[PDB]
Design a protein around this ligand. Structure first.
Ligand code: HEM
Ligand code: HEM
Ligand code: HEM
Ligand code: HEM
Ligand SMILES: [Cl-]
Ligand SMILES: [Cl-]
Ligand SMILES: [Cl-]
Ligand SMILES: [Cl-]
Lengths: 284, 286, 286, 285
């Protein structure tokens, strides 16, 4: 009843599209072209707070990406629509992008774009395995899917300073992540600022589990990780980010030593029906 | 006791805005020792962002990050730690001063964003419209922009224009978006409420929302538009204006959003000037 | 005794082309010490450009810079000193290898150009047409691409496609530009003389102009198109083909120039392989 | 009867170079109808490249594509069909004029390259050295730049500087690369033969290689450097200079290549002016 956000491993190639609603009067023609194409597998769709506000509607649990008043930067760059394309090669995704652009215009204007790819079967560009402690199976459904079959996804485009980080001694890299790069073993003696120490899913009250589908990226803006986290609500992601940002106990996550998010967005993933994507709470 | 430059009558012919992230806080003293003697408030202005204050465990009354507006239009919040405003003679001089500031601020600060700005004609937006007609001048500008202690609070947005769409509209449709006539800059009393000058009428707020604007056009690989800059004695004037423009006051959205949208957003505290340079004392005391 | 990976069909799913300028030739020995142990001719291929040979005061028979064609279409000559062809499993591996090669090759070499390439739909151009159908295979490929001493001479062009224009044409007009039918790749004998496969028919030259092509699609901020690569036992095959495509043989210009244009052009000598690595002796002897 | 603006010294504070590819030559008439009335030779100069002439099956004496130098340094040849030189008061005016020229010139022409250029400190390179000290002036400039029929032949290269490397050199080493003293622009008679002014000494050639340079610094995403422009009554002066700079005359390479390298290269024919606009008659019967 949900989309294909739980399919593991992440595809070898993906592309993230973010649109601004520039001409709301042309919205019906855009939806008529877009909605029949959203199968939740090769094409996923997320709805942003501006689109809901433009329709004068309300989605329980939906809100723009938050504003954290911290010593580290987490920008809020909320858009109206997020499209997640998954495919076989980057050329297919490029041609599919052009078709979606022309089909969504003039109602929607493309505001941002990111090509993403799987690295070495699921590693960050720093080399560390990504997704080790993700919930799987039925635990993944309970962490990511709400009762009505919808999901709430958070997105950040993290930009890595690879030259600084990879020039550190391997023990210093391991103390930033909280795991050993050589064999992915957890470092129990890592400082409290270590990433996996900051984001330990069982260390929150209530527990802050989420389903992450992050993928590395690289273009003219640099290189890093396209962070994606699916949850039954934004509660899990938001308390994690606030602890990572030092807003819980004053200790800042080690990731901010070498990486920084360039964007931030919240999106509501609608459920699927027997006849396509179920946007009924928005179109009545 | 302010920094001046921000009140200097016309905008300089060329300027450059630099935005830095506080990447290594342990190296901050050396960066400040190199930077502060160069801040004269005329050729080089400085603004302090909320992350820098938070990293020092201090607090500046009136300072906060760029707000989050839950509206039908997009106003992103992209707050950085430090804002440097270079004003100069040519773009090459500003480029060379930029490189020198980068080496002096490193490794404590990492350059996060940059925009070259230039004066167009006598002070016009790239659409052709005059910019600054109803700005406060003289003592009214000081009262609107400068707080009692001599500091100022500046808001910044990098607006990106869709010039092809806007300039292809009939001139009457362009005029109804701005609220003034491009042919002679006359105000249109019969413009719809969504017109920009109707949305931002400084006397139509309670209390009055006057501010001192120093916007300048820009153009690079990201496109072209207006680098919007608004100085105030507090952020109240700018923020109540932006919320009305975004339709959060009465449901009417400003006409600017038909062809333009901001890519960035930042709040910065402009410290006052003392007899011996920039006064950063509320951040460097005990 | 050649660089085996130039005959590998199909091309790997991901590759990256690097082009370096010899910026400080006095620092060449340290760069070669780091580079040569990595050149296996499979995951990393190497080509030597005429500027590098001239900087050493030597000569390579068959090597010369990319030619200058005085035609009505543009084939720019952007010859560099070194060409590296990286092939790998995913784009991230090639990115990390690029950074390592950049730091190891410095300061002697400066990276002048870079292109990420990928296989599309099993070996198709971004326009949809199959690429490589009439490539020589087996022993014929060796005879067309490999010189007697085991070296090869490779020509490179970065072609930029106007996909919106081309794909908006009626399918019959697209087919007459390529010379083959998109529906089933069958050759059109009744295509106009300007059709690509009519221009480049390898048996229609005297002597025959066979070559081994390893082109791969590309896409970045500059646009999208085909990273054209042609291996030959000499540059004779490629050059007579390009001159006919450019209308310098019979006044008829190839149809590809209706929607695509090369942004770069380079000639590079691929040295032979020995039992213990790349054989650069004709360049570092005596 | 030339395009006045090419002798205007100093160059205006802001300019923009546009280079177009002839993508659809059948659509050329509508493009020329829109373009030619705008070419005054002052705010808008025009140069014709060899591909445009070849596409019309014509020939211009003295015109040819940018040469191919087989040297140890890189001078790329990136010849285009059309060169437009916009000059104005601010970068925004040039930006709006560029968009208008793009829409008017399409679909025949496609914009292939663009460079914003600006005057630095009254006429200095970004390295600080004065640029234009030994340019011909007055009637000597006319004799060096203008052919008999009033046309000119202009060479263009987009030079990219490595300012970090160059400005980190000792001041004596910087001076030996240029051949002049940065403090007061005095000529260094004891500078090495590789020094720029020693390589390019206009009187040290037979015949003499004088030309009128109108170079201006530039800066965008590709870096920063000098947009080199040289006007001559023919291409002989520029080409014999460049071959010496590249070490093809005596094996000595110009010191500029230690910190700078050209990214583009083009030759263009600047048609003469008549009393009623640009004279393209040798190209349109
Ligand atoms: C540059 C950005 C990031 C990088 C490179 C990164 C990388 C990693 C790595 C290598 C692990 C350990 C392997 C694993 O369990 O998957 C991990 C764990 C985790 N990360 Fe991140 N991550 C990033 C951002 C984030 C953010 C922003 C959040 C939440 C707001 C987050 C939440 C988590 C969680 C929940 C875990 C699992 C913790 C556990 O072991 O229970 N990650 N991350
Ligand atoms: C693309 C962005 C913008 C453009 C092109 C633009 C342009 C203009 C123009 C042409 C005028 C009329 C001439 C003048 O009074 O100076 C004006 C007035 C004004 N604008 Fe904007 N502006 C932009 C953004 C903003 C924003 C974001 C704000 C506030 C949050 C703002 C506040 C004002 C105010 C206060 C006035 C004077 C209104 C009055 O007459 O009292 N502007 N603007
Ligand atoms: C935008 C640039 C180009 C594209 C999209 C392209 C595409 C194609 C396609 C679709 C074919 C037919 C299938 C095949 O046999 O491979 C082909 C054939 C061929 N191409 Fe190209 N090509 C390009 C540039 C070039 C250039 C510059 C040359 C030579 C200088 C060249 C040489 C050949 C040859 C020799 C053949 C085989 C001809 C034969 O049937 O005997 N190609 N190309
Ligand atoms: C990065 C590229 C270049 C830079 C920064 C540069 C800069 C300079 C400077 C500082 C001078 C001395 C002051 C003056 O008399 O103008 C000069 C002189 C000169 N340059 Fe260049 N130049 C460049 C490229 C070229 C090229 C490519 C040519 C010719 C092909 C050239 C030809 C000349 C000539 C003829 C002179 C005058 C020599 C004399 O007779 O004294 N320049 N240039
Ligand atoms: Cl989704
Ligand atoms: Cl940056
Ligand atoms: Cl400028
Ligand atoms: Cl000086």
């Amino acid at each position: 009843f949900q989309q294909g956000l739980l399919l593991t491993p992440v595809p070898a190639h993906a592309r993230h599209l973010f649109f601004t609603l520039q001409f709301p009067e042309a919205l019906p023609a855009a939806l008529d072209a877009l909605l029949p194409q959203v199968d939740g597998k090769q094409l996923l769709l997320g709805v942003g707070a501006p689109l809901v506000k433009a329709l004068g509607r309300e989605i329980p649990g939906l809100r723009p990406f938050p504003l954290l008043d911290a010593a580290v930067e987490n920008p809020s760059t909320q858009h109206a629509l997020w499209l997640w394309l998954r495919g076989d090669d980057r050329g297919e995704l490029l041609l599919r992008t052009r078709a979606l652009e022309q089909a969504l215009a003039p109602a929607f204007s493309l505001a941002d774009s990111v090509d993403a790819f799987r690295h070495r079967g699921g590693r960050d560009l720093t080399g560390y395995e990504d997704g080790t402690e993700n919930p799987t199976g039925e635990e993944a459904v309970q962490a990511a899917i709400a009762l009505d079959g919808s999901s709430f996804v958070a997105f950040q485009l993290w930009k890595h300073d690879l030259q600084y980080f990879k020039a550190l001694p391997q023990a210093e890299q391991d103390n930033i992540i909280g795991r050993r790069l050589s064999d992915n073993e957890e470092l129990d003696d890592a400082p409290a600022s270590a990433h996996v120490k900051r984001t330990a899913q069982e260390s929150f009250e209530p527990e802050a589990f989420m389903v992450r589908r992050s993928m590395p990226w690289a273009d003219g803006r640099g290189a890093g990780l396209a962070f994606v986290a699916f949850g039954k609500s934004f509660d899990a992601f938001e308390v994690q980010l606030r602890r990572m940002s030092g807003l819980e106990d004053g200790i800042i996550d080690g990731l901010y030593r070498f990486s920084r998010p360039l964007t931030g967005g919240y999106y509501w993933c609608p459920p699927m029906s027997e006849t396509g994507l179920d946007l009924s709470p928005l179109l009545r």
